[PDB]
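Try it yourself: sequence plus adenosine-5'-diphosphate, in.
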Amino acid sequence: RPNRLIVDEAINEDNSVVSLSQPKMDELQLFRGDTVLLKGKKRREAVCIVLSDDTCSDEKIRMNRVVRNNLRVRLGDVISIQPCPDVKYGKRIHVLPIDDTVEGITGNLFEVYLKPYFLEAYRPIRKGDIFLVRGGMRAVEFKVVETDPSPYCIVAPDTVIHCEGEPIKREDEEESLNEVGYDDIGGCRKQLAQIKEMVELPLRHPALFKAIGVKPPRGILLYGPPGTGKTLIARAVANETGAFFFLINGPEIMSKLAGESESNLRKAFEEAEKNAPAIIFIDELDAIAPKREKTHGEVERRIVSQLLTLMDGLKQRAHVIVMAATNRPNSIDPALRRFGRFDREVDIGIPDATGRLEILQIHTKNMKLADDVDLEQVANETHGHVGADLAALCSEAALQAIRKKMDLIDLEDETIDAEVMNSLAVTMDDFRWALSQSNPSALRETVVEVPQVTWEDIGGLEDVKRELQELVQYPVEHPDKFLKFGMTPSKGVLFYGPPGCGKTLLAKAIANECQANFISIKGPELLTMWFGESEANVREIFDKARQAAPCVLFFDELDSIAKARGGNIGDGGGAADRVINQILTEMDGMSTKKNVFIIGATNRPDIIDPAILRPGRLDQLIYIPLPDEKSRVAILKANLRKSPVAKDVDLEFLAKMTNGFSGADLTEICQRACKLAIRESIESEIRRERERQTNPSAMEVEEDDPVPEIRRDHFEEAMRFARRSVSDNDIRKYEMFAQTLQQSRGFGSFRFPSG
Amino acid sequence: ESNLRKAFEEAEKNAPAIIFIDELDAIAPKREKTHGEVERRIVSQLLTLMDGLKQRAHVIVMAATNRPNSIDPALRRFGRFDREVDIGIPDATGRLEILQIHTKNMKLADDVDLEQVANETHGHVGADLAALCSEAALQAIRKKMDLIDLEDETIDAEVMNSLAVTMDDFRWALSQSNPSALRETVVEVPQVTWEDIGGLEDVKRELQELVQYPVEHPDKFLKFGMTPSKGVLFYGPPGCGKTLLAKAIANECQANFISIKGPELLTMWFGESEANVREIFDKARQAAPCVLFFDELDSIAKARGGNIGDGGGAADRVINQILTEMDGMSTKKNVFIIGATNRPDIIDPAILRPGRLDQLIYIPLPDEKSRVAILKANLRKSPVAKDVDLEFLAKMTNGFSGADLTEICQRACKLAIRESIESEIRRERERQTNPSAMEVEEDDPVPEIRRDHFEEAMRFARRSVSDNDIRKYEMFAQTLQQ
Amino acid sequence: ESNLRKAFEEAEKNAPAIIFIDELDAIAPKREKTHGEVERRIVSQLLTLMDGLKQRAHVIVMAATNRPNSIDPALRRFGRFDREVDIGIPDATGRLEILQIHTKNMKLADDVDLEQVANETHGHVGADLAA
Ligand SMILES: Nc1ncnc2c1ncn2[C@@H]1O[C@H](COP(=O)(O)OP(=O)(O)O)[C@@H](O)[C@H]1O
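Structure, out:
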């Protein structure tokens, strides 16, 4: 019977929309916008409009809460969908309001609610259905008790709707559709998917897990930077799946006068057991169960013990699930991680790039953005921001836009005109001004993201390209071959070469090509942990790297520590010992099954301690040569691609004269010409302005002042200031070390011995 | 304290019974850890109630704690808690038994071989294994999918009628496994046998003379007035497989093996020094007999020599503690200590004294037949095909350690993988170019680990060890010879 | 706690108000400084009452303090105190205006050189100039 569909949580909040997958439409020959009949329990029927959505699975039907209550069904059940091609345009529809929704209004229901809701909607409606219409503050639920024709009818412009009479009573099924959904969460795709996987099944089907004897999770710790909107995620999940979300705040359990505080907690838990499938949310967990050494009195210990005893008291009983939020996974008491208590941890990281866009596209819903607004550019230029910061930025941009045009909207008051204020299309200047006066919150925080650097940016270094290809791509793409052959992949690679070049660019390019997270570690923070705390920091860095597997960890300037060891200090060697030993010990404990690569780059190889260069640690050594011809041309093209044009010069000629030049020097050479262009353009503008003040309106017509192009003469002007960044002796030392290493692998070939 | 007194009084009234106290550290931590006065009152009440068990009834009190140092030493006097039992992390057999116990109600498929499944779970406990089983079942469920079905009020039977768990489920669960042991020492009888290593008849003879004899036949030792040697120090070129020798002799002696590495030794300089050494040697003693193994013993001096000259104090601290701890050993327990190093001339002379590490054994590089045997040990793999002779492979590889041979063996598999993957990609491309040209599933290229693969792999043969080291070691040996 | 609460609902029931909490560091100090137990309760009460400003509210809360390190970090999340303004020490010109307002009631002579005084008073605040 390939006609039924299993209901699932939907995204669209409209009362008459259902989301279907394309194979279902192809199988049932259902078009877009047609009326379909849905049947559930209690012999109830409803009419819906088919809408396209590729997110939903073929077997699952996305269908909202209002029709879910109309059909007297719950999520996870099965409904019957059939085509309804016999629908006819309605003649008259009689609707009545519920008694406990019109309390204290005293107004025209038709003009405020019915007319805007039924305008250009063509909603098919049926007798006995409940539909919810939003208003100023409340949401009014209306019931169709009479229709013509019955039971199926289509709202049409020539339809008489009556809304006069005594309101009907409550339907005892709450017939509601409200509050947040999945559309209000952005930039958390992976985390939201993970939360859905392990929370939906124990709640939607409270017996299938018991059939296989799978223990559902009994506690989930969502930890991340503050302000990311974890409470919103929990509320959306609870409201979508269907539960009794009971938020208990942190400080509210501490302001009470001692004893009764504990009682409150106890009450909450029992208050959450009668209602069946409930999701308790303990916000600000660190404020009531902090680190043990922070505690100084006795009440906090009693509260912690009470919480632990109750949490162990959730053994079986109902399907209640405990979700707690904190800041970092080391501030809470270390005793709240024993099996049975909080054991699953989810990292809600800082949104990056693409995700940020959706956040803005959520906030700029009602506001009418101008055509000149480029939200993609705003998302790209803004980094280190969280949802709260972006919301505040949008709010202050709107405030600036309305402040500029104050007198045009009758600055006094007088029932502010909606169209006039809506005409305030926010401009790009407003967004830039808001960006200038906006202090972010993330700032100093490690960022995990997928880089966008591609291989064509660098020349390619086809030998090194193939070597890194073999080292990285194959283990993750095809691990079946490795497990068949039993070979254990290499875990570390060490680069060496002249300073600058393309180390970081190569690492980011291979990380992008492998489609894996990237983490950048630099020398200054290495020396930061050198001067003091040297054990923990590396530990949580490695746990963070492991948690987001697969990833390509990068250690930049690993030799820097040694640079501190060899000098006139002779005091921090203990710190270097601490750092190196911690790094080596943590690499030794890294299981080979987890795909966490480690790439370290050192400018001076032979100073580093030969302890690292041993099996089980960074094994392969790769020499990165200076860019030559083709790589130089690629770097120059990438640099010039940013904005200006150079359609007057020969690039391979410049590459010919620039032998022995590193990539950074080429970037500086490209940058100098732009400064020359800026100076010439500004001086020309000043000359034009001065000759304009000498004779008013001297150039009435705006001619072609120097437009963007880097002319040839600018290229000689910039190139005259060129530096040989690296001296030849550095190349001599690098090649001498390379040949010293290579001479080990020297043997007089082979002759197929006795085969 | 009223509840505790009531519990003890009730247990007194109801015949010989067992009282279990869970999380004893939560109620009786160290005295100086305690801050207020309620904790001290509770601890003293517990002490008094414990001391009040004179006769009374046949009541036995059993308590569980995580670490043996968190307990207030007041709860260690005779009459109070005096017998200690350590429930260590289960070994491979224990993991297999736990997996057998948990995978009872689950209807598995006829494709499960839990041997390597337990083998690949180094560092897990019972709860982690149960979570892994649940995750595997959960993948079984989500791969089945609730594709428009009517599991209402009959869900359990309707799903249990036909379900199974396959290899891919357990593989995923192994990927999504976060072990809880990790940073924790391991004690278990090793598995490496004498066949794994190659030759070295004299070293094996000496090791079995100094290890196997005093444990299997201690009566003759006592009759003849024997004090067996307590320590042996291995020295030689690096990468010769000293740890293999130690593990093999431990396996032959059927004694537990405990390993301590270099980085941990250097880490113990800065911060906790007394506690770690004390607890590790106590743990070695309690699990007698055991062969305690120290790796990279010379690294201490390797940090002393440099432009810093500040870590020498902590190095002397650790070495002093270790020396004082060996001097306290007793012949009662068969505790054996083995040290390994590659730079013996920088070892402090205080170590090489009677009672401490005295016997020195030089480990020569594998030669001729030993190279054949180590390759044969490496010759297992899964995909060895039929291969070729190896005597001249040993003949050509004079002066090559085990690490170089392992690298040479590993490089050939890399070339084979590259060949197989490039062939597969070319085949996939030609499938796109010509549809339906490979309707029949033609067999993929076999594991052709062929002569040419080895020939190209061992073209990059590295002389990892130099030549002057051998004369240095033989000069040191001649210095020993008198 | 009763006084602070009563002040909050008293400000709630009257008009758009501006509650000014003076010397905030005296009641919400650094975590390590909170040796007692009453301070934690007062801080929690303040946080809860601050968060109890649900949407419909005309109350704006302003606070005064020294360098923004003595204030406990939990008071600087989103929803609580978020906007910060630095009232720096006035410069020579600012000192000139401070002298100007402070001397409007005063009857000065014809030898007064307010510009020189403003120039020479580097390192002073309004109270010092008033004194
Ligand atoms: N789609 C979204 N993704 C992430 N954050 C959001 C989104 N929409 C709103 N937010 C932010 O969530 C905040 C509210 O969540 P909050 O109660 O602060 O949770 P928490 O206290 O866990 O940070 C708002 O300030 C808003 O800026």
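One thing you can check immediately is this: Chain A touches chain B through 65 residues (CB under 8 Å).
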